[PDB]
Amino acid sequence: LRVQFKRMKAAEWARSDVILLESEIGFETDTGFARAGDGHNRFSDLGYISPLDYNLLTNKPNIDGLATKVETAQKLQQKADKETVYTKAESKQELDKKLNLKGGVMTGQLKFKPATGGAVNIDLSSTRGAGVVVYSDNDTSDGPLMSLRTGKETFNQSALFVDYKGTTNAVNIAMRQPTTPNFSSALNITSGNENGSAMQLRGSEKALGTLKITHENPSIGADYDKNAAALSIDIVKKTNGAGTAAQGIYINSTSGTTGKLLRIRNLSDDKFYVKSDGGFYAKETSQIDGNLKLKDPTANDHAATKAYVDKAISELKKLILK
Amino acid sequence: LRVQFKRMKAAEWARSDVILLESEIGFETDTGFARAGDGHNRFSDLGYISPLDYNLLTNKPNIDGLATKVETAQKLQQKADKETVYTKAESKQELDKKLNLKGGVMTGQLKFKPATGGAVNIDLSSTRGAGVVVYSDNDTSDGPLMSLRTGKETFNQSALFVDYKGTTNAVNIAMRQPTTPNFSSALNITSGNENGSAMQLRGSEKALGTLKITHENPSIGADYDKNAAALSIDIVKKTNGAGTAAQGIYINSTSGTTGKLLRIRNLSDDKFYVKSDGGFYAKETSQIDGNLKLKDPTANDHAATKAYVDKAISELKKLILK
Amino acid sequence: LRVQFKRMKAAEWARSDVILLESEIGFETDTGFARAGDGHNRFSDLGYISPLDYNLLTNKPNIDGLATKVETAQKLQQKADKETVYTKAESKQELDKKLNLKGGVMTGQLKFKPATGGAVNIDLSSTRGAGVVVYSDNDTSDGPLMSLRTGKETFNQSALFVDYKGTTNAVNIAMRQPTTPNFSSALNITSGNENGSAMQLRGSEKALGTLKITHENPSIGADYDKNAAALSIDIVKKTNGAGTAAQGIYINSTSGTTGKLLRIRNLSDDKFYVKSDGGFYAKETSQIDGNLKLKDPTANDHAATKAYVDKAISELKKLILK
Ligand code: NA
Ligand code: NA
Ligand code: NA
Ligand code: NA
Ligand code: NA
Numbered sequence: 001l002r003v004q005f006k007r008m009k010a011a012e013w014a015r016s017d018v019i020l021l022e023s024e025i026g027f028e029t030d031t032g033f034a035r036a037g038d039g040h041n042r043f044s045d046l047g048y049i050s051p052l053d054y055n056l057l058t059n060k061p062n063i064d065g066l067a068t069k070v071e072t073a074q075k076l077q078q079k080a081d082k083e084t085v086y087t088k089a090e091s092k093q094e095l096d097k098k099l100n101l102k103g104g105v106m107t108g109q110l111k112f113k114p115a116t117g118g119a120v121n122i123d124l125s126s127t128r129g130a131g132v133v134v135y136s137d138n139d140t141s142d143g144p145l146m147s148l149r150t151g152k153e154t155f156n157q158s159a160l161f162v163d164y165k166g167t168t169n170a171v172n173i174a175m176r177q178p179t180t181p182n183f184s185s186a187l188n189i190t191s192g193n194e195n196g197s198a199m200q201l202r203g204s205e206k207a208l209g210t211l212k213i214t215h216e217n218p219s220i221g222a223d224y225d226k227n228a229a230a231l232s233i234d235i236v237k238k239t240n241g242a243g244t245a246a247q248g249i250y251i252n253s254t255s256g257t258t259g260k261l262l263r264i265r266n267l268s269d270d271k272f273y274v275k276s277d278g279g280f281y282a283k284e285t286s287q288i289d290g291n292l293k294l295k296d297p298t299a300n301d302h303a304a305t306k307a308y309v310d311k312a313i314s315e316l317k318k319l320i321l322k
Numbered sequence: 323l324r325v326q327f328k329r330m331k332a333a334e335w336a337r338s339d340v341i342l343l344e345s346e347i348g349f350e351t352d353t354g355f356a357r358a359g360d361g362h363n364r365f366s367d368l369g370y371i372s373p374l375d376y377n378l379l380t381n382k383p384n385i386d387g388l389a390t391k392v393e394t395a396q397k398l399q400q401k402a403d404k405e406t407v408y409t410k411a412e413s414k415q416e417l418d419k420k421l422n423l424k425g426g427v428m429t430g431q432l433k434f435k436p437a438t439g440g441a442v443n444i445d446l447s448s449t450r451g452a453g454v455v456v457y458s459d460n461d462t463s464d465g466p467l468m469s470l471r472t473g474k475e476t477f478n479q480s481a482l483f484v485d486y487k488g489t490t491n492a493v494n495i496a497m498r499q500p501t502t503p504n505f506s507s508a509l510n511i512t513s514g515n516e517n518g519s520a521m522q523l524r525g526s527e528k529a530l531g532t533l534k535i536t537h538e539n540p541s542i543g544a545d546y547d548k549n550a551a552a553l554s555i556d557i558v559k560k561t562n563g564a565g566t567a568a569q570g571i572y573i574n575s576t577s578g579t580t581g582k583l584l585r586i587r588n589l590s591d592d593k594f595y596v597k598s599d600g601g602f603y604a605k606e607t608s609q610i611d612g613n614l615k616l617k618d619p620t621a622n623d624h625a626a627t628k629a630y631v632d633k634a635i636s637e638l639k640k641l642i643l644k
Numbered sequence: 645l646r647v648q649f650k651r652m653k654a655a656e657w658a659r660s661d662v663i664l665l666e667s668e669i670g671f672e673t674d675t676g677f678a679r680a681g682d683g684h685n686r687f688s689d690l691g692y693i694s695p696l697d698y699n700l701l702t703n704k705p706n707i708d709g710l711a712t713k714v715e716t717a718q719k720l721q722q723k724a725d726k727e728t729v730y731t732k733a734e735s736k737q738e739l740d741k742k743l744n745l746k747g748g749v750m751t752g753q754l755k756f757k758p759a760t761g762g763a764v765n766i767d768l769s770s771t772r773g774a775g776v777v778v779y780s781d782n783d784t785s786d787g788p789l790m791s792l793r794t795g796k797e798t799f800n801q802s803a804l805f806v807d808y809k810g811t812t813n814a815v816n817i818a819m820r821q822p823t824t825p826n827f828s829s830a831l832n833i834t835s836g837n838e839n840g841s842a843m844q845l846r847g848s849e850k851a852l853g854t855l856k857i858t859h860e861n862p863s864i865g866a867d868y869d870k871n872a873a874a875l876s877i878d879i880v881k882k883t884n885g886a887g888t889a890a891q892g893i894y895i896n897s898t899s900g901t902t903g904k905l906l907r908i909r910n911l912s913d914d915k916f917y918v919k920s921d922g923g924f925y926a927k928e929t930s931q932i933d934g935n936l937k938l939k940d941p942t943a944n945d946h947a948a949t950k951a952y953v954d955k956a957i958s959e960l961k962k963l964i965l966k
């Protein structure tokens with residue numbers, strides 16, 4: 001036997017009314033596939049003669065090891081997008097533009113506009129360095145090293161307040177000798193306030209002056225500084241004013257002193273002084289371009305008055321002539 | 323021939339002892355599947371009549387193109403989690419709160435507590451702007467523009483040290499004329515140290531005063547300032563003290579000067595002076611409410627003493643009366 | 645009928661010349677698989693008797709739900725790599741090292757080297773706190789609280805400029821009383837410039853002194869301060885110099901004053917003064933260790949000259965003797 005089976009093309013079968021017997025095979029001539037009858041169904045309703053169920057295959061791929069689109073998308077949701085985060089390089093670029101608390105170099109202006117005190121507060125209690133150090137070795141400039149300004153007439157605090165305990169000078173100003181001399185001063189002060197002293201000084205020295213001024217000859221030449229003075233006072237009118245009545249020096253002691261009010265010495269020898277009572281001493285021959293009004297003499301070394309002379313002359317006259 | 327095959331349900335086959343001949347087909351009536359005998363195996367041990375091996379399929383999916391869960395997880399491991407990284411927007415928010423080295427506006431206190439010197443160091447050698455600029459146009463305040471304070475009696479440095487070379491004033495203080503006059507000063511200094519001068523000044527002028535004081539009439543009225551002075555000195559006791567012996571002005575020259583020790587002028591004309599030797603000159607008639615003790619006259623314009631008069635009178639008496 | 649089919653091993657078939665009739669089945673004895681003839685093809689060119697097309701399977705896996713390697717890689721490309729981005733913890737570590745505009749504590753030096761003015765600009769117009777507060781409660785130190793230095797002789801601005809409107813002192817320096825007295829001053833000023841006054845002061849007081857100096861006894865003892873003065877002046881030569889000709893005090897009024905040029909009081913009583921014309925008054929008995937050159941007396945209380953005496957004596961002599 002070489003058995004052949006009922007057979008036609010797959011399309012021909014699908015329209016055929018031929019009913020295969022139970023187990024009887026029919027063959028699709030253009031596909032090479034067989035189906036077996038159940039004794040009632042037409043051929044298009046028969047199944048193939050061997051399984052076509054993925055579950056039944058051998059050598060299946062490892063499907064359960066493969067990622068799903070859903071699970072992948074869920075995980076990617078937790079990850080940061082490149083676009084919306086800075087790289088370390090970018091972060092470093094940004095951070096390098098900002099000041100370290102450790103210290104740094106500012107290249108632009110630091111402004112304070114406020115929202116122990118101070119906008120700037122420097123506590124040196126634990127260190128041996130300076131607080132604020134400003135310097136310029138520039139030839140010239142358009143601004144001072146430091147400027148303090150108040151703008152309202154009511155302003156009720158100082159521009160600069162120095163509260164000092166210590167063993168050296170609270171404030172020291174040194175104007176160094178220039179290569180060539182110029183018109184400048186170490187300290188210049190002006191006030192246009194008529195109801196307060198431009199400068200006030202108070203001290204409580206045991207054996208020194210409250211203000212001590214020394215003039216030192218800038219030259220070795222004995223009379224180079226013949227026009228200099230330790231203290232120089234000028235008393236002037238207002239521009240376009242009619243004059244002035246201001247005094248030069250005024251000395252008082254509101255509680256009463258027993259000291260000399262003015263004492264002038266040279267080589268530490270008293271040369272001229274005004275005692276606490278107003279009497280004076282002068283060490284050498286002196287001159288008044290005028291008269292001197294004084295009391296009649298009582299001691300031999302007292303200056304005689306005109307009245308004393310005239311009386312002596314009159315008495316002698318009366319005595320001689322009888 | 324319509325051939326039919328040995329056949330029963332799949333479950334019936336699996337328990338059957340029927341041995342199919344080699345190539346003989348048996349059919350599962352409930353599944354439609356066939357298996358062919360090997361001449362010895364029972365039906366449950368026979369394979370189906372067509373392959374069920376995934377490898378042999380046509381139109382296979384592209385498995386090798388699909389991502390594995392393992393490879394995906396390995397790659398995701400290298401990616402940054404959203405939760406643990408700042409967005410650019412967040413980074414910007416944080417950076418904007420920090421000071422740029424370029425410059426910026428502080429709104430709170432900058433404190434220095436330290437771990438060429440200075441906690442703050444400003445070098446203006448290459449620029450033409452100011453160093454530290456403090457100002458207030460506030461009506462009033464509870465603090466000074468600038469405050470320097472030292473707290474220990476041993477402190478061995480100054481609060482403020484000015485070391486100045488230049489062509490203008492090292493320190494300039496201007497107290498501007500107020501709308502209406504008040505009791506304030508441009509500079510006020512107090513010291514309670516008994517062993518040092520409250521203020522010390524030293525200069526080496528060729529032809530100027532070490533201290534120069536000018537009083538200017540605040541008015542055009544010729545005697546408006548009749549009660550003013552360029553220098554005013556007061557000499558007072560301690561509160562609850564018994565008195566004072568302090569001197570007013572003390573002048574000396576420890577090395578010896580040939581200059582006038584006090585020289586008083588008006589309109590640049592000498593009116594009264596004390597020479598380096600202590601002799602004085604006064605330009606006009608003067609008054610002592612007391613006697614004047616001096617030497618016997620030798621020149622015609624010398625004041626005569628009582629002794630000189632008395633002797634002249636005595637000699638004349640002796641001469642007349644024989 | 646138990647039908648058996650032409651059959652041999654799969655390898656034997658692949659070399660066989662046997663041509664199966666159309667639909668005739670041949671069996672591979674070692675594989676259990678059948679193929680059916682087309683009436684012309686050799687067995688290796690026949691297809692199996694049931695489909696082997698993946699598309700036709702039932703129970704297929706959800707391939708379209710599985711992620712591809714390509715799509716996964718494309719998505720991962722948009723995600724940030726851990727290595728190249730800082731964590732929040734790292735960002736915080738870096739930010740905490742930088743200064744907040746709100747305020748902060750510097751622990752290192754803040755330098756300004758510059759690329760209303762000031763490297764540091766403080767505007768207190770809207771607040772009641774201080775600007776710059778420097779202090780030290782250290783026992784000692786190697787630097788001042790504040791230092792201002794200029795290095796070139798041409799420098800044309802001040803180290804410190806105070807421009808002040810207000811109701812209190814522009815600058816106040818208080819040297820507090822030390823536990824034990826020492827050699828220090830509240831303000832020390834030196835200048836080596838020969839062409840400018842070390843210090844210049846100008847004021848326009850109505851009824852006060854431009855400079856006011858008070859000395860206060862540091863003790864309750866009436867003569868404790870017997871060696872003190874409100875003002876002390878010294879006039880010295882240069883080291884290795886030949887001497888000095890500098891004056892002590894120089895007073896002038898370049899426009900002409902009608903005030904007393906020097907007025908010395910005690911307990912607010914005039915004791916000695918030099919009038920605007922140079923005549924003086926002294927309240928008590930005085931002494932010159934020398935002669936006094938003056939004018940011939942015209943009033944009874946004028947000091948007599950030697951010439952006046954000698955003339956009176958001569959006239960009396962001529963009168964008596966005829
Ligand atoms: Na005395
Ligand atoms: Na002496
Ligand atoms: Na001289
Ligand atoms: Na003149
Ligand atoms: Na007058």
Ligand code: NA
Binds near residue numbers: 911913
């Ligand atoms: Na009085």
